[PDB]
Design a protein around this ligand. Structure first.
Ligand SMILES: CCc1nc(-c2cccc(C)c2)c(-c2ccnc(NC(=O)c3ccccc3)c2)s1
Ligand SMILES: CCCCCCCCO[C@@H]1O[C@H](CO)[C@@H](O)[C@H](O)[C@H]1O
Length: 337
């Protein structure tokens, strides 16, 4: 049957949750809603419960709620945030107004683990491996993260890592094409980010700590060189081309000297991730097979996602339609094993 709910005032609204979730304590809040830590008596897990704010206030809010719930329900992988539970106190669609999402309580992100220090090479292999493993899965669903950074990487005390699309400096890890509003993005935009994160774990220093947009791009070109002919022939914007040919030629730096001291296999991998031309960057699948990850790579335990129907993105529906579709997704949810 339906669980027994209780009501408690938290973050200035009445939260109504199943009695399995105990000891709600706010962690934080913002425009999106707010989040309480709780204990799930049923599973023995520490969890985070998020009450969405204004989920159906407008067409756009409603479609965003639907998008969020669909994504969360589809993501079932150890290195990606997933859903333990979703609930509403409403007993019918007619009563449906509030959506609550439940996931594992997370207490630290990659910045907290790193502390601007060098990590050991073995530690970097393990962390980067997990990121790539999660990215293979995400990319296999025809999804691109687009803003992968340390603040979106949760890590527990066993340094098990999960990719998030939220947080628990902002542009230092972005692909250069993303910062130049290129569109037509490749999934390897995320691989650029992995390269920036990996470099920083090894060296203890941000790779491209630009002061602003143009400075970021200047630091990038100084390392990887100015665009070569092969890259230039794929640029359709006549302003971008003539600006690019007008810059002084700079060669690609010698990565072996830049990251001197590093495992030469790490250097090799960085050379394959941090390529300006997104078409020539290594994929997540290819990177998992790279010799750097030999102690962790298991081709039979690097799973891919089921096909992910994102056709709803192209649709323009009424608020009550998005609301109804969301309600269907709440009611049909089956918790993980
Ligand atoms: C958009 C903003 C956020 N959303 C969630 C969240 C919560 C439940 C379900 C889902 C899908 C996301 C967040 C979440 C999820 C899990 N753990 C946390 N934990 C924390 O924020 C945290 C931070 C410091 C100390 C202790 C705890 C937050 S943060
Ligand atoms: C002056 C700085 C130049 C930055 C060049 C970035 C090149 C990124 O690479 C480009 O990505 C596009 C997808 O986004 C693809 O369509 C192109 O084929 C690919 O070359």
């Amino acid at each position: 049957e339906r669980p027994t709910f209780y009501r408690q005032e938290l973050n200035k609204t009445i939260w109504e949750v199943p009695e399995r979730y105990q000891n709600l304590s706010p962690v934080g809040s913002g425009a999106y809603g707010s989040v309480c830590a709780a204990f799930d008596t049923k599973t023995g897990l520490r969890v985070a419960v998020k009450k969405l704010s204004r989920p159906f206030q407008s067409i756009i809010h409603a479609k965003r709620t639907y998008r969020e719930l669909r994504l969360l329900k589809h993501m079932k992988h150890e290195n990606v945030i997933g859903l333990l539970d979703v609930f509403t106190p409403a007993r019918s669609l007619e009563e449906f107004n509030d959506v609550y999402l439940v996931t594992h309580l997370m207490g630290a992100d990659l910045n907290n683990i790193v502390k601007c220090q060098k990590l050991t090479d073995d530690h970097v292999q393990f962390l980067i491996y997990q990121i790539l493993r999660g990215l293979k899965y995400i990319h296999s669903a025809d999804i691109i993260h687009r803003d992968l950074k340390p603040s979106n990487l949760a890590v527990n005390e066993d340094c098990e890592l999960k990719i998030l699309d939220f947080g628990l400096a902002t542009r230092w890890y972005r692909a250069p094409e993303i910062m130049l509003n290129w569109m037509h993005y490749n999934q390897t935009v995320d691989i650029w980010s992995v390269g920036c994160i990996m470099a920083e774990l090894l060296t203890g220093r941000t790779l491209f700590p630009g002061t602003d947009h143009i400075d970021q791009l200047k630091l990038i070109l100084r390392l990887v060189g100015t665009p070569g002919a092969e890259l230039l022939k794929k640029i359709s914007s006549e302003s971008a081309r003539n600006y690019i040919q007008s810059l002084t030629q700079m060669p690609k730096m010698n990565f072996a000297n830049v990251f001197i001291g590093a495992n030469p296999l790490a250097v090799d991998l960085l050379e394959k991730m941090l390529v300006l031309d997104s078409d020539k960057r290594i994929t997540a699948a290819q990177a998992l097979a790279h010799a750097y990850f030999a102690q962790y790579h298991d081709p039979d335990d690097e799973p891919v996602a089921d096909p992910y129907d994102q056709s709803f993105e192209s649709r323009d529906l009424l608020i009550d339609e998005w609301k109804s579709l969301t309600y269907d997704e709440v009611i049909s949810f089956v918790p993980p094993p």
